[PDB]
Structures are given as structure tokens and as C-alpha cells.
Fold:
Amino acid sequence: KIRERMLEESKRIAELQKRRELKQAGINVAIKKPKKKYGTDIDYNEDIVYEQAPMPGIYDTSTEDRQIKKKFEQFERK
RNA sequence: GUUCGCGAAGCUUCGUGGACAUUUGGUCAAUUUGAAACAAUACAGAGAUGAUCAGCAGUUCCCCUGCAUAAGGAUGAACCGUUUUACAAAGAGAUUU
Ligand SMILES: [Mg+2]
Structure:
């Protein structure tokens, strides 16, 4: 099992290396093939449970989130 | 077209008023682009445990075969990994006011 895992990891790194090599060309990372209608847990958001609308509700939270996300764009860029 | 009445020409023929009968079918339109699977090649490859092997379950936002609430599917599939805080009390030494 461990060996299999290791192999998988190796494969993944190889893939990454390949993409790095062919970076000047536009390249997309291959997704794990689905077996019987599953979720790719990047998109969609998985089975979300609510924030639960409370009494002392303030709208700065959204702003904060946006701010947080701004930084990650920068990271992506670099 | 059927016909039951009226009006003109020669029971036969035209012109009319009515009655009869009355709204089908499509969640679909014919080849690639609205989603079938096996197969094949290559590559590995078989539950515990030292090894070999049986069977049963269990969890799941995985299913298949099965008439099935039988039974069977690699022990049917994935589970084998990650694992640092409701965290306080006492003692000793050090820098800052
Ligand atoms: Mg068996």
C-alpha cells in the first residue's frame, strides 16, 4: 500500500516536472479520472453547511475574505 | 358527401337555408458534439500472518451480477494514511519597568 502511494507520489512529481519543462507552451494538469460521478473538491465547494444567519451580523467578514483572497492571487502570480 | 326543406329550367338538373360530422400528434425531430461498456497494449499484481488458504461481517456522497429481504462479486470497490491545543498547576534561573 505504502509502496503504491510512493509510486503515485513519484508519478505526480514527474508530471509536475514535465509541465515545468513545457511551461512556455500552455499546459493543463491532468485530473484524477472519475469512476462513478464523484466531486473534484476544488470547484463546487463540496457539501456546504451554512454560516447560520445570527443576530449580531456585520458585513466586514466579506471584505476580510476578499482581502485574504487578494493575497493569494499575488502568490499565484509569483 | 349524405341528406330534409325552399326558388328556377326540363320525376332530371342548377341556385340556396338547415341538420349530420366537427381541433390529431410530439419529454423524441435522421452520423460524429451531450456522454454504454467490455476488449486490447504496456506496466505491475493477490486480507490477516512468517507463509498458504476459508468464510463472515463493518463504514461509505462506489457500484455490478442476481427475481431477490437468496447468493455471488479481488476478503466485490475505497478503508492500511495522517496523528502538535476544552491544556492547567508548582519549583528554579535570566532580560525589561
Ligand atoms: Mg474470495
